[PDB]
Q: What sequence folds into this?
């Protein structure tokens, strides 16, 4: 009855007496968070939080507000975690219900412009459910690297989205770098969702000052110029290499080590966390502000039409947010080229060779190493999907590892290293930020001889351990990684004729691991920084004087970088009716 | 024989003993300019310059270098101007000749991607000849406002290019704001031009450091990071509102009046001109650099393949330069919203009404005010055009003007005002920088009563006064405005069904005009700044507290702004075989 | 004086316009031009066999060329009251000497009213259909 209380709460409809809520307003999120803490403050056990919740609900607190508060609460409750009690599937959300007929998508010559074809990817249920849980995970308060994770996750989904775009030969995304820009294609949620919220017409923009028809109770006036100023100041700070503090001459100095965490952190206004590192000083919140969350707020404000509760729901579905995510990625690009890193600095004493990406089923009589397969099946319309449901045939990768260490590894003194696997569309291969992370795996050597390490798709450190539509996986009853990347989207869709990609594998020595952060932050723990080694520029390239060096030359240089290897493979697109 | 000497010189082919020249390298442009001055230094008359020229030529100076030098020389020679001796038509350029068969364009499903359809507009002979002369005009050393003109001309061609894009329902241009970007479509000059220079493949980029295969004699190493730093510093300066000087505490302070001239000037490294205003101080060239011209240099460097002379030729043809031009436009957007202007500040004491855009021929039995016509005819392949030659049926605009002045205007005391006409695609109408300038015209009133001012297309202050392919116009033997906007491109192409645009007309009091600058700078002389009033943000909007105000509301408010009027019209696209 | 190129525009790139490179090929056209001089001469027994084969063989090639660009197969002119829905304009250099026809042009049922009898004997559509029907039968 704990579990059905939770489902009952998450099902509660917003009614007309409920004080209006804006799940994309920083002011309202502050309130939501305090309410979440309120739930926590009612005691050590779940039934305590749920009692407080019921109480607040019959005091007519907004149910959407409660859903966000309860979601965070459950995610970070030690009682809930050990009792395996979880926030509900996204499928349980009120928007996944009507109010008789199941409305499909309008696929018409009039509606098939811009990046409309990518709707199958943006509406993917498991991407959306993953993203939905991610925010519950992220919004909880040990874990040090909020800013690093924020930037990396968003940059990594942009690289995948853009790569998916290239597969259909569609344009790359125009980042939302200029805030007076137009959204020239306009957007309409899939018809089943149009009941609960709307889109916006072609050539919508931010409001310069505010939406006149949007009540002040939903939305604090943040003029476009105010956001631009914050942006300009974060730009200036990154180039200058410091973020100004409240005290005149103690700026926080950016370093190779802290740049992404701080740039990401400030973008997301995590001044309480970041400040705990400034030895009695405070970051100047007036100068840098809260750009990410007020930015999202402006898209909500743009879309608001003639207050009514606004839910933080379905952001990945909307193309305007991908333009914002690529803007976020821009800050990452700036910082990354400003603080390069030595690609040899943490090399494992190992020689890599023979990297392969393959199907698991090698029975076909036309079979080859490096030729793998995706498919487009029917979307599940009841799960709010459109145009297709992407999937791929089971794949694996393997690589050959041979020790190089002065003392031969033994059963008494093993060599432990970490294999890091990335792929990139061949055209984008020389852009650091276009590399897509596919796996991270520990290898332990006990001999002088070469081993072949094999990794399945379904064991990937990057992947969400569920079947389609959040169906559980027996093998992964413990570490489900609900907010990881959907297994069905692990591979870019590819092309019918077979699209060329490059696989990259680096072996690092990561030293002895510190204990991983407590749940639910245990998935983002890396001695090297998330997305290493593509998360900063490489000093081998920034200091190149010949002009010949690129990512391509380095990762093809087995002689000079034996702890790196790379190989080409092709992804073939398929339709399964 | 002066005229045939000039044609003879401009025809001179680059041979293999000629020292290599890079018409897009700032170092080489410095040399070219000194050689141009050299020609000037040989005496007051044309035959003097041409003697020096011949001399230098037989001393084996590079002919492409000479063409640039001679071009500038002729353009700014008082002797040449009064003797109506001009730099040759672009058609005379060596690239307009082979080395038997006339090669047309490859129009194929493989080659019709991205913005390939816009080739007719980018390859337009008269746009290209106009642009070609413009640089000869611009590169001469009274004229104060180089930076203002630079930014305005480039922003104005971007607004037109982007609007032309919308007519075919193609995407807006992605600005070259991120210097590690890809050019995903690749480019090939029209087949006739491929002999003399090449394009670049899909997903070309800047070189991080330099082109390894490009000799140092053509190209100084300017790594991408160096350009980004300049960009970052110009960004920071605009937000801070000062450009740092060589002396610690005397920054040049930006003002509403000087912002565009300085921002534009610094982008184009016009430190000698700009410095003459800093009362004994110098702008810090190390901090802000020469971003525009080194930027163009990087596209040349990217396109250079396996030294050979590089000509500054055909930039408007190449889509990568439109991405750079829109980047230039970004600096204009930043400055413009930083220093708003009062839209009433220079109002003429007049009431405007009844703005109309019409065909000149009103004989058709389906004729209506506000329905005008463009056509796409055959390109002239021998003039290096592709896909089509745009043109439009003759149009005119008119507007009603009635005085408002306290003393009634009379023949003894006339009221003199200036009418400024702009149009904008209806979707882009609320973006200042999307407004396209169509005309500027003085009106003189001598009565209390309303007049109707009529302006023909062919009298437009904005237009190049030539027929197609640089054919002269009798009526305009004096002020040809060779570097103005081509008459055939004055109208956006429109849509078959008739595309909606908005016309805008403001009446200003400009005071008594100071004498216009000497030839050839007499076309860009405006008391208000080029592109007024859309060249800065409007204070009526930046200070709006209601959130209701837009460009659309203001220009529809006849009551509060009687000196502004606006009207909708439609442009219809047509094909003439 | 000026060399007019082709109008390649979104408005003009419909139907089988992309195949223009193949249909306008000089050497196909010069070959076809000589072929008729060859064919129209009066030993040679198999005019009808050659006529049908050459035309069937260029259709197989044209249709195959169509498939390469993923364009539709050709609708045969089997129904004489059919429409030509795309319309045609000769390449601009040739437009001087003869014209094309607009979208949805058709045969004239009876005759072109504006075409002088000195160029054109009246052969109504129905008369051609009858011949066709009889050859079918």
A:
């Amino acid at each position: 009855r704990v579990s059905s209380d939770v489902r009952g709460i998450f099902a509660l409809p917003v009614q007309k007496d409920h004080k209006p809520y804006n799940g994309l307003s920083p002011e309202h999120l502050e309130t939501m968070k305090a309410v979440s803490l309120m739930l926590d403050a009612a005691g050590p056990k779940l039934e305590d939080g749920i009692s407080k919740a019921k109480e607040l609900l019959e005091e007519r607190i907004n149910p959407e507000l409660m859903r966000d508060a309860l979601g965070i609460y459950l995610t970070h409750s030690k009682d809930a975690q050990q009792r395996k009690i979880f926030p509900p599937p996204l499928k349980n959300h009120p928007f996944f219900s009507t109010k008789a007929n199941v409305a499909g998508e309008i696929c018409t010559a009039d509606t098939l412009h811009g990046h409309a074809l990518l709707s199958y990817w943006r509406d993917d249920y498991d991407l959306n459910d993953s993203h939905y849980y991610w925010h519950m995970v992220y919004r909880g308060a040990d874990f040090d690297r909020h800013g690093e994770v924020f930037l990396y996750v968003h940059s990594q989904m942009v690289a995948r989205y853009e790569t998916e775009s290239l597969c259909w030969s569609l344009p790359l995304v125009r980042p939302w770098n200029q805030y007076d820009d137009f959204l020239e294609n306009g957007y309409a949620p899939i018809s089943s969702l149009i009941e609960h919220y709307g889109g916006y017409p072609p050539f919508s923009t931010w409001y310069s000052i505010r939406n006149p028809d949007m009540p002040d109770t939903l939305n604090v006036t943040i003029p476009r110029a105010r956001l631009e100023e914050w942006r300009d100041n974060i730009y200036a700070a990154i180039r200058k290499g410091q973020f100004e503090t409240t005290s005149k001459d103690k700026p926080l100095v950016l370093t190779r080590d802290n740049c992404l965490n701080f740039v990401g952190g400030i973008l997301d206004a995590q001044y309480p966390s970041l400040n705990k590192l400034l030895g009695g000083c405070s970051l100047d919140e007036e100068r840098y502000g809260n750009l990410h969350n007020y930015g999202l707020g402006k898209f909500a404000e743009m879309a608001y039409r003639n207050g009514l509760t606004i839910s933080n729901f379905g952001a990945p579905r909307d193309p305007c947010f991908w333009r914002w995510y690529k803007h976020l990625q821009y800050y990452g690009r700036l910082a990354a080229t400003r603080y390069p890193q030595d690609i040899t600095a943490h090399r494992a004493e190992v020689v890599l060779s023979n990297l392969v990406v393959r199907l698991q089923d090698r029975s076909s009589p036309h079979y080859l190493d490096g030729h793998i397969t995706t498919f487009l099946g029917p979307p599940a319309v009841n799960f709010m999907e459109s145009k297709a449901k992407l999937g791929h045939e089971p794949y694996e990768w393997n690589v050959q590892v041979k020790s190089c260490r002065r003392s031969p590894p033994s059963k008494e003194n093993p060599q432990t290293l970490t294999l890091r696997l990335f792929i990139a569309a061949e055209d984008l291969m020389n852009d650091y930020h276009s590399w897509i992370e596919m796996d991270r795996a520990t290898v332990q050597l006990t001999d002088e001889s070469a081993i072949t390490k094999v990794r399945l798709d379904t064991d990937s450190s990057v992947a969400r351990k569920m079947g389609n539509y959040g169906e559980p996986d027996p093998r992964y009853a413990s570490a489900v990684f609900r907010h990881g990347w959907p297994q069905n989207l692990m591979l870019p869709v590819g092309k019918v004729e077979g699209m060329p990609f490059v696989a990259f594998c680096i072996a690092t020595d990561d030293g002895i691991p510190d204990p991983a952060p407590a749940p639910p932050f245990h998935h983002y723990h890396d001695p090297r920084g998330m997305g290493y080694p593509f998360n900063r520029a490489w000093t081998q390239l920034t200091e190149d004087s010949t002009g010949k060096a690129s990512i391509r030359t380095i990762i093809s240089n087995a002689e000079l970088y034996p702890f790196i290897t790379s190989t080409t493979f092709k992804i073939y697109r398929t339709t399964k009716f």
